[PDB]
Nucleic acid binder design. Structure first.
Lengths: 53, 260, 47
DNA sequence: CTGCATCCGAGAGCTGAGGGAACCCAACCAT
DNA sequence: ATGGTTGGGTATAATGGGAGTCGTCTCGGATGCAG
């Protein structure tokens, strides 16, 4: 987050837009408290049988 | 990028095959490696499978994640053994490496055999992987003293593995291997009878052609138990809006009238 | 019996939706005004 | 470092009623 | 006590697969060009 905040001072507009796009997701993760590694599955849930009869 | 079959075939092609000298060399190395494993097992007095696990960990290296502490401890617990009785360990390491080269080089037998087993309910890649499983079993059990080529001993294991995988994974409802073979015999007999007689045969004719212990009633039951479930989303009508499962009522839960 | 119908409850289709959304490794949780969990399954799905 | 400018891939397009491919071999567990 | 089930074996040699789609429009990133 500090690195992208520093990047937000670039004169380039495209660089600023890309850094802002990265910061959106980074700040969403920081605010929600979710860990990024949870986007990788280790155990896959199995739906109850009555909904796949 | 896509089409994993092309990726797998290219990766397989990147590994060269062996010549007769290479094949006999590798097989001999494998044999002396297993013999050395057994000798080291006798020397140390431990269970063979555990020392085998230690050797496998050492060949695979730290790259392959059994924990590091145990395997390291026993590795140095074998370095304590005096010289002359140590060559065996190097021979076992070499033999394990030789198994790796032999398997990688002979993987192509799996594709060559399996390319004529498509269309039996299993995709090509599952057939190939099961064939590699049979290939590992054939490699481990191969005896080069008979001077026979590897292909002769490998083909039988490959066919057995592929056929067992077909019997176990082709159907949603698992049916034992013997009954699957019985259904196979029934189907081939029925198609042969149809071809010779020129029309769809009756159950009695098939039962008579099977032999003793077979009547029409058992044949009906066998055809009955060979049925596979249908999809709940089978499109009904011209428009893509009506499914089969939308016409299935619940007969288990009590109705509102019954509850009242 | 001649009385008036009672107050409604959560429809079963929403329970199906919650079950199918959890099966995609997404945690859908119903909360009350005080941000505490509310169990809509009547303790039939909690270990 | 701007600005144009195609270039490619993704995701949508009314409701309702009605739609119909081996064989053998021998051990082993449930009941 | 009984059948139906479960796992193991077969030795000339056998060594990179195979199916394929075409009369739609609109929107938002992505890549490569001149300035």
């Amino acid at each position: 987050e500090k690195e992208l905040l520093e990047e937000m001072k670039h004169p380039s507009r495209a660089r600023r837009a890309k850094a802002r796009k990265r910061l959106e997701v980074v700040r969403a993760f920081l605010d929600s408290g979710n860990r990024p590694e949870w986007m990788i599955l280790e155990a896959v849930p199995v739906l109850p049988p009555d909904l796949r009869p | 990028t896509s089409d994993p079959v092309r990726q797998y075939l290219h990766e397989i092609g990147q590994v060269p095959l062996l010549t007769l000298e290479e094949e006999v060399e590798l097989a001999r190395k494998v044999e002396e490696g297993m013999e050395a494993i057994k000798k080291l097992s006798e020397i140390t007095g431990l269970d063979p499978d555990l020392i085998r696990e230690v050797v496998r960990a050492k060949i695979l290296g730290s790259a392959r994640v059994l924990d590091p502490k145990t395997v390291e401890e026993i590795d140095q617990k074998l370095k304590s053994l005096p010289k002359e009785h140590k060559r065996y360990l190097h021979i076992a390491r070499e033999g394990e490496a030789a198994r790796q080269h032999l398997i990688e080089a002979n993987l192509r037998l799996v594709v060559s055999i399996a390319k004529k087993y498509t269309g039996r309910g299993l995709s090509f890649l599952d057939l190939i992987q099961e064939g590699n499983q049979g290939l590992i079993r054939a490699v481990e059990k191969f005896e080069y003293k008979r001077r026979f080529k590897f292909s002769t001993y490998a083909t039988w294991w490959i066919r057995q593995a592929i056929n067992r995988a077909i019997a176990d994974q082709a159907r949603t409802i698992r049916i034992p291997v013997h009954m699957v073979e019985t259904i196979n015999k029934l189907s081939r007999t029925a198609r042969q009878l149809q071809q010779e007689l020129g029309r769809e045969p009756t159950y009695e004719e098939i039962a008579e052609a099977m032999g003793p212990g077979w009547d029409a009633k058992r044949v009906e039951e066998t055809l009955k138990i060979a049925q596979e479930p249908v999809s709940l989303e089978t499109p009904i009508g011209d428009e893509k809006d009506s499914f089969y499962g939308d016409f299935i009522p619940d007969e288990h839960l009590p109705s509102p009238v019954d509850a009242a | 019996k001649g009385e008036d119908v009672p107050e409604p409850s959560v429809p079963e289709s929403f329970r199906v939706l919650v079950k199918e959304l959890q099966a995609l490794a997404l945690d859908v949780q119903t909360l009350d005004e005080k941000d505490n969990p509310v169990d809509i399954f009547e303790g039939l799905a909690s270990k």
